[PDB]
């Protein structure tokens, strides 16, 4: 079939690699592996090394903090492709087999496995102004030559391919998500009730999300308005643990309800990036070049995963708010409200191939 190749500026170091993506099963990932070809005449005595690096930028290199860098590594691995590691004999994949068959004798394989609990390749919306190597997590594979591992990385004789690791929707749909609450106040004993639910548990990007809500206004008060929202809780792990929260989409409704009455309705709304350009810090599902990706898909974390190592984690929650009037013998436009949240999942199905920034 087709495979991806790329040769170093020195024209003599080329890498061959089948799939750019590497799907991530809940506890398994496609082993990332390829074959590198070089003109031995050039290689007087140097050794050829290929390295996988999982970097994580969190501050643009132009940042002003003295000394403190902004590029943490999560996992790197090195392999001396040539000399072809006699003691290290690997079970060459059939892909490497066929590649070897095609190219000459001067090609040599390389094969990295991946730690299971690692983040999907995501990048944070770089906003209008800044440029360069964008933020977020990233996976690269370099190939170069040197006699010493710590020696300088002479640019013209090395080549690197970016790589993305992604996940697809769990084939078995989960339990239908929902929640409910009640609120009472110093006025009387009649806590109004509020239940909310979702059509299903997993949604594909653009699948219209439908909230179903019911409310029983027992108390002698009036709900002024309703505000439904879909928010992107994006946890960032570092030396510290911080969490951001960006409202990805929303809607509101002036469906007032009288005291002691009741009401119910289904609303709907769709998360989508189009109208969410300007919001910096938003998380995107990773890019190779500046290809406009889609709203970063929720990380289907394995239950009880050791999220401490996980650089970035993403999750999407819908949230319903009922704002009411506290007026009366003591009250005005200023008043309190109720809110309830339902987490869910937003991912892709399991297709047979991905688009390399086309159309």
């Amino acid at each position, epitope marked *: 079939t087709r495979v991806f190749k790329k040769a170093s500026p020195n024209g003599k170091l080329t890498v061959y690699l089948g799939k750019r993506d590497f799907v991530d099963h809940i506890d398994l990932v496609d082993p990332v592996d390829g074959v590198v070809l070089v003109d031995p005449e050039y290689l007087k005595e140097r050794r050829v090394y290929v390295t996988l690096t999982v970097a994580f930028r969190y501050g643009r290199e132009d940042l002003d903090v003295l000394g403190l860098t902004f590029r943490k590594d999560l996992f790197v691995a090195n392999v001396q492709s040539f000399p072809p590691a006699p003691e290290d004999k690997k079970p060459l994949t059939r892909l490497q087999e066929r590649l070897i068959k095609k190219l000459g004798e001067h090609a040599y394989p390389f094969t990295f496995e991946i730690p299971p609990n690692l983040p999907s390749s995501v990048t944070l919306q770089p906003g209008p102004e800044d440029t360069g190597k964008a933020l977020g997590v990233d996976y690269e594979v370099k190939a170069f030559v040197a006699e010493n591992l710590e020696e300088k990385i002479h640019k013209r004789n090395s080549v690197r391919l970016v790589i993305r690791k992604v996940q697809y929707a769990p084939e078995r749909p989960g339990p239908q998500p929902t929640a409910e609450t009640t609120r009472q106040f110093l006025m009387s004993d009649k806590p109004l009730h509020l239940e909310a639910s979702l059509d299903k548990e997993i949604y594909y*990007h*653009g699948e*219209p999300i439908s909230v179903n809500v019911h409310v029983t206004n027992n108390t002698n008060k009036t709900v002024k308005k309703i505000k439904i929202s879909v928010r992107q809780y994006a946890d960032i792990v570092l030396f510290n643990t911080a969490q951001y929260k960006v409202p990805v989409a929303m809607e509101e409704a002036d469906d007032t309800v009288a005291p002691s009455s009741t009401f119910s309705k289904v609303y709907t709304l*769709t998360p989508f990036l*189009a*109208n969410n350009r300007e919001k910096r810090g938003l998380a995107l599902d990773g890019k190779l070049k500046h290809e406009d990706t889609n709203l970063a898909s929720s990380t289907l974390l394995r239950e009880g995963a050791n999220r401490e190592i996980l650089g970035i984690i993403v999750s999407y929650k819908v949230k319903v708010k009922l704002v009411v009037s506290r007026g009366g013998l003591l009250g005005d436009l200023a008043s309190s409200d109720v809110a309830v949240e339902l987490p869910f999942t937003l991912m892709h199905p399991k297709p047979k191939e991905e688009p390399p920034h086309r*159309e």
Partner: antibody
Amino acid sequence: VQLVESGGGLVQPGGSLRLSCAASGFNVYSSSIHWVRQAPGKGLEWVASISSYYGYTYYADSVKGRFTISADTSKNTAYLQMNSLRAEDTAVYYCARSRQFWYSGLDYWGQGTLVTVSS
Amino acid sequence: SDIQMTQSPSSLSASVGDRVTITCRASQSVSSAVAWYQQKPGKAPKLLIYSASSLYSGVPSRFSGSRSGTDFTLTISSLQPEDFATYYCQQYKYVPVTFGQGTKVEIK
């Protein structure tokens, strides 16, 4: 699964017409739209494209700016006010959906509509 | 640029039960980003194969095709009467998405 299309007919040069088509069972935010020309007895000619989930549109270099495509999410419909007819536009026009994620070809086609420029 | 396509041949007469090939070359390298569609007279066309290899779900596997450099090509394994129609190739790697001159299947 179906996809209706209408809003076409006979128009005068330079004129305008908002040919539209609706997607029964397609959240527009997951299925880009395109329109494509067929000159009667000639090869198909892509015309325009809209991708709601990015707001991007792309028009035919032949008539870049001459027409204007758009969409209506509230009804899951797509609009195209063809304007300023350059006479190379008299043809049949189809509107079709991709998968706005992971383009895999024009998997579904409305019945199109014949739109010709004349006097 | 505006990549051009060349559907060769431009017409074809053939017989029932025959296995037939039709090609089209691209003015550049579009890297298998091509789809083959069918269209009968009057009716609206339908996709047949996307990515130049994968047959669409809902087609008989007698259709096939492959890519060699800038030249892709499809084949039918046996021309049924339902298969006598016009066939288009169309790349998509480079906006805008041009088709080819196409190809029309005639009776022997």
